[PDB]
Amino acid sequence: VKVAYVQMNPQILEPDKNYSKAEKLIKEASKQGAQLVVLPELFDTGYNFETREEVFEIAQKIPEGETTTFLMDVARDTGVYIVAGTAEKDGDVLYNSAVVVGPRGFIGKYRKIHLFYREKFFFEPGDLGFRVFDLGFMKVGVMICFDWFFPESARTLALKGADVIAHPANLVMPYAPRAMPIRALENKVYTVTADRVGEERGLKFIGKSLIASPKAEVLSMASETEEEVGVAEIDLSLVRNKRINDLNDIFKDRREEYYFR
Amino acid sequence: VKVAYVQMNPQILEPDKNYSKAEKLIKEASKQGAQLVVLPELFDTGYNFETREEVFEIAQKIPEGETTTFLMDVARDTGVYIVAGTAEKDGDVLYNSAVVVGPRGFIGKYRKIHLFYREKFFFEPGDLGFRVFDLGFMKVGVMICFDWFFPESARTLALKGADVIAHPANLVMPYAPRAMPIRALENKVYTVTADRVGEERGLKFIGKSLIASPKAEVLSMASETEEEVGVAEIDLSLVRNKRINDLNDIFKDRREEYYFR
Ligand SMILES: [Mg+2]
């Protein structure tokens, strides 16, 4: 099975422009054979808000709102599964979320657990835990952006049987691209970090989207500045068998009685 | 404060030869200003055993046995603190251990929690948890070799206030040197990986000892095959403050409610 990132430059406060760009690139990923496509964090709203009001005013409910229903449409037309970062309105509150859709409809959502820098001024910390979505042919865990920084994020997803971790990102620090192959290695999973590119009100994003294998190899890596799609095939066996040799299995060998105490 | 690795080539079942080599290199690290010097895993006995009995008959007790008393003499003479991997005889049983010694004598021991590969035939799994030893001027966490693979090892040490993780190792895989900077970054600590070199009954070790900073920088790195020492200055303030910006403190931001479940 082929998985893909879409690396795009979301236009702040312009969802329709971002829907148009997303559809375009998701179609390119589809045409290159991808079955799972991952978009960046906050792909619909952009990131660097001055005020909560400017995002709250346009943020969409999940699953009834425009971002989710747009993605359903594209999933249905292209026949791919999509994981995409979106601002989530839920009553008076806002979450920094990711929605999971398939060609047959809405699958689920994840709310970012570890908020980064000024996100804490706009978003409520995620409260649904680290979820793994079973697509039948594979299990997809989701984490967003700065969640990478905590090794417990990827570990919790891998422990719940993620085959691939879809990872919408809007990276500003330089570290994640070198850390993601380690996250893939230490859990024996695949990772798909779909980063944005661009400059938004003085803040520059690092691009460098990448697909990492359970042997910490980089299967696809994107430029710093360009909008692009990257596709790689993934080996479900390389991830469903936690053996690293005949004497060691990663999950059998963990000794939780000695961790965090 | 300056920390150091000693990268050496233990000669299997020849502890007197290994004591002599260690002393030479420890002095050389001391001469370069090191206050803490980390030696490889099983530096006294070597690693690639074929019977329990060949290691059992030579393994020393901690702290009264020959390896800890040797190291105490060296720490007394040179004024340094030493973390060294050693085969621990305890009663009828062996552990794959690390001793911590300083100018005043024995400080403590750690027993390798995650046994690697054939080690399981010779040693009991470690049973003391991940311990942090308070030297006053610094707190030193200890883990051994394959412990690096589980992010939970370093994380447990860091949560207990380690300024530096001393990491005796006998690496055979190529991954640790890429991963150690991410362990240092994600916990905001320093790490000192003291690897061996050499070929031992046909097993090849990879060397490449390294010191990693809390910004994922590598401060010193050794060759694949040479016996050598490596020293770097560490900044304690940089590890004790877990803030990575004015709005994120790594430890406050952890959300253990969502981990491993
Ligand atoms: Mg060097």
Q: How far is the CA of B210 from the centre of ligand 1 (A)?
A: 9
DSSP A124: B
Q: Report the candidate in B43, B37, B83 with the shortest Cα–Cα distance to residue B59.
A: B43
Taking CA atoms, what residue in A is nearest to B157?
Answer: A260
Is residue B152 less than 8 Å (CB to CB) from chain A? yes
Helix axes A176-187, B176-187, angle to 10 degrees: 110
Q: How many CA atoms lie within 13 A of A140 on its CB side?
A: 30
- Tokens representing A247 are 């004497």
Q: How far is the CA of A260 from the centre of ligand 1 (A)?
A: 34
Q: Report the candidate in B145, B133, B79, B135 with the shortest Cα–Cα distance to residue B109.
A: B133
Q: B151: distance to nearest CA of chain A, Å?
A: 7
Chain B partners within 8 Å of A146 (Cβ): 248
Q: What does the alpha-carbon distance between residue A47 and residue A50 come to, in Å, rounded to a whole number? A: 10
Q: What does the alpha-carbon distance between residue A141 and residue A158 come to, in Å, rounded to a whole number? A: 8
Q: B1: distance to nearest CA of chain A, Å?
A: 26
DSSP A113: S
The shortest CB-CB distance from B151 to any of A186, A245, A258 is to A186
Q: What does the alpha-carbon distance between residue A251 and residue A241 come to, in Å, rounded to a whole number? A: 10
Tracing tokens 């050794």 back to the chain, one arrives at: B222
Q: What does the alpha-carbon distance between residue A169 and residue A193 come to, in Å, rounded to a whole number? A: 6
DSSP A216: S
Name the strand (E) or helix (H) holding A82: strand A81-90
CATH no., domain A1-261: 3.60.110.10
Chain A partners within 8 Å of B113 (Cβ): 255, 258
Taking CA atoms, what residue in A is nearest to B131?
Answer: A261
Q: Report the candidate in A42, A51, A10, A48 with the shortest Cα–Cα distance to residue A201.
A: A48
For β-strands B60-61 and B2-7, DSSP reports them as unpaired
Q: Is A172 annotated as a binding residue?
A: yes
Is residue B260 less than 8 Å (CB to CB) from chain A? yes
- Measured in residues, chain B has a length of 261
Is residue B186 within 8 A of residue A150, CB to CB? The reply is: yes
Is residue A128 within 8 A of residue A96, CB to CB? The reply is: no
- Of the residues B186, B244, B254, B261, the best mutation for testing chain A's interface (the one with the most A CB atoms within 10 Å of its CB) is B186
- Residues forming beta bridges with residue A60, ordered by sequence position: A88
Characterise B134 by phi-psi region: left (phi > 0), alpha (psi -120 to 50), beta (else).
beta
- Of the residues A117, A128, A182, A203, the best mutation for testing chain B's interface (the one with the most B CB atoms within 10 Å of its CB) is A182
Q: What does the alpha-carbon distance between residue A44 and residue A23 come to, in Å, rounded to a whole number? A: 12
Taking CA atoms, what residue in B is nearest to A245?
Answer: B117
Chain B partners within 8 Å of A171 (Cβ): none
- Residues forming beta bridges with residue B6, ordered by sequence position: B229
Cross-chain Cβ contact A258/B156 below 8 Å: yes
Chain A partners within 8 Å of B159 (Cβ): 260
Q: How far is the CA of B196 from the centre of ligand 1 (A)?
A: 14
Is residue A137 less than 8 Å (CB to CB) from chain B? no
Is residue B48 within 8 A of residue B201, CB to CB? The reply is: yes
Is residue A251 less than 8 Å (CB to CB) from chain B? no
Cross-chain Cβ contact A247/B152 below 8 Å: no
Q: What does the alpha-carbon distance between residue B32 and residue A15 come to, in Å, rounded to a whole number? A: 59
Is residue A205 within 8 A of residue A199, CB to CB? The reply is: yes
Query: Virtual CA dihedral for A192, A125, A179, B160, nearest 10 degrees?
Result: -150
Is residue A4 within 8 A of residue A230, CB to CB? The reply is: yes
- SS3 labels along chain B: CEEEEEECCCCCCCHHHHHHHHHHHHHHHHHCCCCEEECCCCCCCCCCCCCHHHHHCCCEECCCCHHHHHHHHHHHHHCCEEEEEEEEEECCEEEEEEEEEECCEEEEEEECCCCCCCHHHHCECCCCCCCEEECCCCEEEECCHHHHHCHHHHHHHHHCCCCEEEEEECCCCCCHHHHHHHHHHHHCCEEEEEECCCEECCEECCCCCEEECCCCCEEEECCCCCCEEEEEECCHHHHHCCEEECCEEHHHHCCHHHCCC
Is residue A85 within 8 A of residue A43, CB to CB? The reply is: yes
Q: What does the alpha-carbon distance between residue A174 and residue A151 come to, in Å, rounded to a whole number? A: 17
SS3 A75: helix
Chain B partners within 8 Å of A248 (Cβ): 116-117, 146
Q: Is A93 annotated as a binding residue?
A: no
Is residue B112 within 8 A of residue B145, CB to CB? The reply is: yes
- Residues forming beta bridges with residue A36, ordered by sequence position: A3, A81
Is residue A75 within 8 A of residue A82, CB to CB? The reply is: yes
Q: How many CA atoms lie within 13 A of B44 on its CB side?
A: 27
- Of the residues B131, B144, B147, B259, the best mutation for testing chain A's interface (the one with the most A CB atoms within 10 Å of its CB) is B259
For β-strands A199-200 and A203-204, DSSP reports them as antiparallel
Compute the Cα dihedral for A206, A211, A213, A215 and give only its sign: negative
Active site residues of B: 41, 112, 145
DSSP A11: P
Taking CA atoms, what residue in B is nearest to A129?
Answer: B258
Is residue A210 within 8 A of residue A220, CB to CB? The reply is: yes
Q: What does the alpha-carbon distance between residue B239 and residue B241 come to, in Å, rounded to a whole number? A: 6
For β-strands A2-7 and A228-233, DSSP reports them as antiparallel
Cross-chain Cβ contact A120/B256 below 8 Å: no
Q: What does the alpha-carbon distance between residue A200 and residue A14 come to, in Å, rounded to a whole number? A: 13
SS3 A129: coil
Is residue B185 less than 8 Å (CB to CB) from chain A? yes
Q: How far is the CA of B208 from the centre of ligand 1 (A)?
A: 9
Phi–psi pair at A122, nearest 5 degrees: -120, -40
What is the domain partition of chain A in residue ranges?
1-261
- Tokens representing A213 are 């294998």
DSSP A174-193: S-HHHHHHHHHHHHT-EEEE
The shortest CB-CB distance from A130 to any of B149, B152, B258 is to B258
Q: How many CA atoms lie within 13 A of B130 on its CB side?
A: 32
The shortest CB-CB distance from B179 to any of A149, A159, A185 is to A185
Cis peptide before B177 (omega within 30 of 0): no
- Tokens representing B128 are 């003391």
Is residue B164 within 8 A of residue B140, CB to CB? The reply is: yes
Q: B155: distance to nearest CA of chain A, Å?
A: 7
Q: Report the candidate in A130, A77, A125 with the shortest Cα–Cα distance to residue A101.
A: A77
- CA angle B44/B50/B51 to nearest 5° reads 90
The shortest CB-CB distance from A113 to any of B178, B250, B255 is to B255
Name the strand (E) or helix (H) holding A140: strand A139-142
Q: Give the distance, in angstroms, between the CA of residue A234 and the centroid of all CA atoms in the same chain.
A: 17
Q: How far is the CA of B183 from the centre of ligand 1 (A)?
A: 20
Is residue B114 less than 8 Å (CB to CB) from chain A? yes
Q: What does the alpha-carbon distance between residue B45 and residue B81 come to, in Å, rounded to a whole number? A: 21
Q: What does the alpha-carbon distance between residue A99 and residue A107 come to, in Å, rounded to a whole number? A: 8
Tracing tokens 């906050």 back to the chain, one arrives at: A42
Q: How many CA atoms lie within 13 A of A132 on its CB side?
A: 21
Chain A partners within 8 Å of B146 (Cβ): 248
